[PDB]
Structure 1
Amino acid sequence: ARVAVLISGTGSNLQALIDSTREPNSSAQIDIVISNKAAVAGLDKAERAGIPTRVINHKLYKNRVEFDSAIDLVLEEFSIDIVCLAGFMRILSGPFVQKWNGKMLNIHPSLLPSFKGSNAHEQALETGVTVTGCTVHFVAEDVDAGQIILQEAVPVKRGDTVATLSERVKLAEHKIFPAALQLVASGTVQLGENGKICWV
């Protein structure tokens, strides 16, 4: 399965995916890294790994559909089979999500359905949970509401901040994201016809 990874920043999840897809038994290969923001560290990680990169400045487009259309063009150019959102911080339009239904994965730093949105750690700390975690899910049009592939719980420690909590959760992200991608790339897991997750 040919994979695109979309990023918006540091790219630690990208790095974990790169590392896992170079294992001999990987069923996925990363053929392109796309960022909506220039000069982010994730682009350096891609380039160090010899992976092509494209920057698509969402700010330069009329609307979400035209921006996504530019992404879709690159995905078609590289004959992509699966899209991983790895720290990608832009909401995708409906028809783009529809097109890639069952082929696009996202990592989210909470145990969905808790704490949807862009500041999950902040919500988790404000709420006072002692257990949080991360989730890989299929992207459906409804944000952070697609079919869940894998999750891993992570403890919250007293005195945790976004900094320290996000560090602990990322160690879990870097395990379940590569594992989830392998499950989808190998055909072990798919979206079923009833739209829910099917273990083949």
Structure 2
Amino acid sequence: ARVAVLISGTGSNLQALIDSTREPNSSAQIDIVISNKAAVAGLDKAERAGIPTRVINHKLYKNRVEFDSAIDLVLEEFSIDIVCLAGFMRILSGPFVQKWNGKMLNIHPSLLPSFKGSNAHEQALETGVTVTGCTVHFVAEDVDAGQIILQEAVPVKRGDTVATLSERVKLAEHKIFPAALQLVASGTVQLGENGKICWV
């Protein structure tokens, strides 16, 4: 399966996916890395891995529903089968989410029905949970609500801050995102027909 990874920053999850898809038994290959920003460290990791890089900005064209079209163009260009959102700070439009339905994955820093949004760790800490974690799910039109593929629990320590908690959770993200990509790329897991995850 041909894969496109979309980023916005450092790209620690991108690197994990790079290392994983480089293994001999990987059913996925990363063919293109797209960023909505330009001075992101994620691009260097991509280039350092010999992966074509391509950046798309907003101040460079029109509104949104068109921004996704520019992305989708490069997607068709590289004959992509699966899309991985790795820290992409940009909500995709209904048409795009519709086209890649069941073919786009996202990694979220919480045990998903809980703490949807871009500040999951602050929410977790504010709420006082002693257990949080991360989730890999299929991207649906409604933010952080698509079908769940894998999840991993991570403890919250007393005195934790966004900095220390995110560091602990990232270790789990680097494990399940690559594993989840392999499950989908190999055909072991698919969105199914009844909308729910299916394990062939």
TM (normalized to structure 2)?
0.99
Partner SS state of residue 31, structure 2: strand
- Measured against aligned partners, the alpha-carbon deviations of 1:89-139 in whole angstroms (never above 9, x if no partner) come to 110000000000000000000000100000000100100100000000000
1:134-149 correspondence to structure 2 within 5 Å: 134-149=134-149
Task: Please list the CA deviations of residues 159-197 of structure 1 after superposition, one character each: whole Å capped at 9, or x if unmatched.
Answer: 100000000000000000000000000000001111111
| Offset at residue 62 of structure 1 (A) | 1.9
Q: 1:59 to 1:127 in 2, by over 3 A?
A: farther
Identity of aligned residues (%): 100
Shift of the alpha carbon at 1:59?
3.4
- Once the two structures are TM-superposed, the CA of residue 54 in structure 1 deviates from its matched residue by 0.5
**For the aligned residues, what is the CA RMSD?**
0.6
Instruction: Give deviations 1:45-97, integer Å, cap 9, x for gaps.
Output: 00000000100013333221010000000000000000000011110000000
TM-score normalised by length of structure 1: 0.99
CA 1:82–1:157 in 2, change beyond 3 Å: closer, same or farther? same
**What is residue 174 of structure 1 aligned with on the other side?**
174
2 CA distance for matches of 1:76 and 1:43? Answer: 20
Aligned to 1:95: 95
Partner SS, residue 59 of structure 1: coil
Tell which deviates more after alignment, 111-120 or 60-69: 60-69
Listed one character per residue, the Cα deviations across residues 20-51 of structure 1 (whole Å, up to 9, x for unaligned) are 00000000000000000011000000000000
Which consecutive aligned stretches of 4+ in structure 1 deviate over 3 angstroms post-superposition?
A: none
CA distance in 2, matches of 1:119, 1:64: 23
